[PDB]
Amino acid sequence: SELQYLGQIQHILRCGVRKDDRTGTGTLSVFGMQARYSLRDEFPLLTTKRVFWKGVLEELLWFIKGSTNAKELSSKGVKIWDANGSRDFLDSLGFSTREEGDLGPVYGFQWRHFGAEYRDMESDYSGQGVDQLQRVIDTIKTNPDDRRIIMCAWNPRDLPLMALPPCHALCQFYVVNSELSCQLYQRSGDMGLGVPFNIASYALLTYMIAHITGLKPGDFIHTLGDAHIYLNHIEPLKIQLQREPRPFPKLRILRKVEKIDDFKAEDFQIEGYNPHPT
Amino acid sequence: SELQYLGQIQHILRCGVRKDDRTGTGTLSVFGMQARYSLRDEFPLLTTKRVFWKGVLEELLWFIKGSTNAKELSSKGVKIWDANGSRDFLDSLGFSTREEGDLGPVYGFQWRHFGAEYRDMESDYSGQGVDQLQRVIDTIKTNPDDRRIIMCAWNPRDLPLMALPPCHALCQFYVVNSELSCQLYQRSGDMGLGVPFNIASYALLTYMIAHITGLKPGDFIHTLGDAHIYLNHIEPLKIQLQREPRPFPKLRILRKVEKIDDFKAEDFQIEGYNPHPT
Ligand SMILES: Cc1nc(=O)c2cc(CN(C)c3ccc(C(=O)N[C@@H](CCC(=O)O)C(=O)O)s3)ccc2[nH]1
Numbered sequence: 001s002e003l004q005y006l007g008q009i010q011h012i013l014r015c016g017v018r019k020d021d022r023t024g025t026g027t028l029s030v031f032g033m034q035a036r037y038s039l040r041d042e043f044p045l046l047t048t049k050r051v052f053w054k055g056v057l058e059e060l061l062w063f064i065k066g067s068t069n070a071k072e073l074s075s076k077g078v079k080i081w082d083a084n085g086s087r088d089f090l091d092s093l094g095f096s097t098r099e100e101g102d103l104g105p106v107y108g109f110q111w112r113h114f115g116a117e118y119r120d121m122e123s124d125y126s127g128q129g130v131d132q133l134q135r136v137i138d139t140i141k142t143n144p145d146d147r148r149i150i151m152c153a154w155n156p157r158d159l160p161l162m163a164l165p166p167c168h169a170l171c172q173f174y175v176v177n178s179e180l181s182c183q184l185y186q187r188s189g190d191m192g193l194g195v196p197f198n199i200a201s202y203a204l205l206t207y208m209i210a211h212i213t214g215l216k217p218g219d220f221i222h223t224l225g226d227a228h229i230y231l232n233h234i235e236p237l238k239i240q241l242q243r244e245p246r247p248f249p250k251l252r253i254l255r256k257v258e259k260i261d262d263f264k265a266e267d268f269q270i271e272g273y274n275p276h277p278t
Numbered sequence: 279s280e281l282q283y284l285g286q287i288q289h290i291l292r293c294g295v296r297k298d299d300r301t302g303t304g305t306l307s308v309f310g311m312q313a314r315y316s317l318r319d320e321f322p323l324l325t326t327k328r329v330f331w332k333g334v335l336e337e338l339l340w341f342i343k344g345s346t347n348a349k350e351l352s353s354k355g356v357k358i359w360d361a362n363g364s365r366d367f368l369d370s371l372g373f374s375t376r377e378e379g380d381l382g383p384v385y386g387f388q389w390r391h392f393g394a395e396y397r398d399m400e401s402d403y404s405g406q407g408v409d410q411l412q413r414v415i416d417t418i419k420t421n422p423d424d425r426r427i428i429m430c431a432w433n434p435r436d437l438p439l440m441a442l443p444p445c446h447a448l449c450q451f452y453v454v455n456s457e458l459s460c461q462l463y464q465r466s467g468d469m470g471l472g473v474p475f476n477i478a479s480y481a482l483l484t485y486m487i488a489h490i491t492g493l494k495p496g497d498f499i500h501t502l503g504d505a506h507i508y509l510n511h512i513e514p515l516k517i518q519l520q521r522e523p524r525p526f527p528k529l530r531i532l533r534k535v536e537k538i539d540d541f542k543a544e545d546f547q548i549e550g551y552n553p554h555p556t
Pocket residue numbers: 050051052055080081190192193194195197
């Protein structure tokens with residue numbers, strides 16, 4: 001099913017009109033896309049180009065902890081969020097009083113404390129806001145047929161405080177025949193970098209929730225708003241586009257976990273990941 | 279085109295799985311679906327089965343007003359929400375102290391006063407909460423390339439207060455070459471009734487915003503979470519699939535409106551809508 005991805009990369013490079021991004025760099029853009037990734041006895045960690053798995057793993061565990069401090073992620077060798085929490089950036093946004101690394105009410109905070117009043121990354125928010133993550137887990141356990149199993153990171157109120165608007169605005173879970181599926185609504189997707197990572201990321205979330213709810217991972221539906229390839233990647237991705245997709249690896253969860261919060265980086269083992277070099 | 283929709287119908291029939299809902303009515307379900315409807319010189323008002331246009335138009339103008347009073351819509355000849363706002367149904371949700379017609383913080387409220395504290399339908403919320411509607415309208419005019427033009431109805435906090443959890447979690451707008459597109463993330467889709475009406479609803483909103491932002495309607499991307507067919511509709515739908523889809527009608531905005539709040543039902547006229555019998 002990695003072909004669907006490549007396909008999406010193909011479709012954008014042959015019907016994708018040009019559209020400049022927030023910065024100034026242009027991109028080839030298509031609006032509204034979807035790809036289905038089976039999670040059955042296999043993990044969708046793209047093989048046509050290596051995905052920064054550690055980053056994926058550590059970032060999610062970071063979202064789950066409810067952390068909004070980029071330093072707590074950087075400490076794990078995953079610096080993908082450091083620039084957005086650096087003294088300069090925070091200042092350029094008007095957050096002069098913010099301790100360095102304080103990203104604001106972002107992903108982690110929304111998932112676990114949606115609606116709560118943000119103070120700073122050091123603050124305790126226990127028992128504050130809606131714990132969407134635990135709610136989806138509990139809903140799955142109690143009413144799997146439920147069609148409102150949603151976790152939304154998009155918080156219009158908190159938007160102005162974020163050291164970045166979330167790309168993963170919303171995700172929905174679905175259960176049938178003891179299979180747990182998840183669909184992500186990605187408002188903006190950098191096909192060349194973020195997307196493969198995001199796919200892996202939510203595939204992981206699903207594996208985790210599945211494992212905790214005693215379900216089997218179903219599918220990960222990936223939906224894109226602005227699916228785009230930055231102009232400077234148009235050829236490199238065309239290079240990748242000709243690479244032969246290899247069998248997806250397998251994600252082994254080593255220990256049984258009672259709660260999403262208990263998962264630790266060492267409980268996860270990617271097996272048989274044979275991605276193309278460079 | 280309508281074939282997309284019809285194709286989705288056959289897919290749910292040919293590959294959907296049996297899944298039970300809240301009422302336990304039983305359904306053929308597929309999780310994760312996406313259709314693309316061109317809004318260029320045509321309005322996606324389904325022809326293989328009449329769609330309650332007046333309802334679509336009135337409910338939408340009703341959302342825009344920020345109204346959460348079903349009596350407000352019901353007096354427009356649209357009772358689609360009356361049951362949910364009835365003394366009886368409100369009491370089954372625990373809103374026994376809530377004035378009849380009061381659906382709680384639903385779409386209208388979510389779109390114009392997001393994050394504000396809901397009191398009741400009679401309350402003045404002006405200046406309170408985030409006005410997503412105007413915001414997306416503003417962003418389209420000032421920075422159409424914005425990859426964050428989102429309008430979210432899914433308020434994790436407000437959800438319980440609503441007579442009914444939103445099916446239109448959020449929608450995103452996109453702009454390229456003077457064309458305004460819109461993608462709707464529908465968590466639960468009744469392919470036999472709601473969906474066609476939902477599709478129209480947002481097509482109408484897109485047509486409405488393109489007009490105020492001086493853009494052309496491009497595409498309306500319909501994304502579904504739990505796409506389903508109720509088992510008792512399987513026979514009907516089977517017949518509909520036989521039907522020859524007639525050209526989609528056309529929407530004409532008679533008056534030249536400047537602000538999203540000035541749109542009146544009179545300003546809209548559907549043209550050449552030949553919905554199939556019964
Ligand atoms: C234009 C743009 N595109 C992106 O994809 C993007 C992603 C993030 C955050 N994110 C969600 C990321 C996921 C993966 C990443 C990355 O830089 N991977 C590198 C290097 C990591 C390493 O090995 O140290 C790689 O694997 O090539 S960054 C922030 C701004 C962005 N900006």
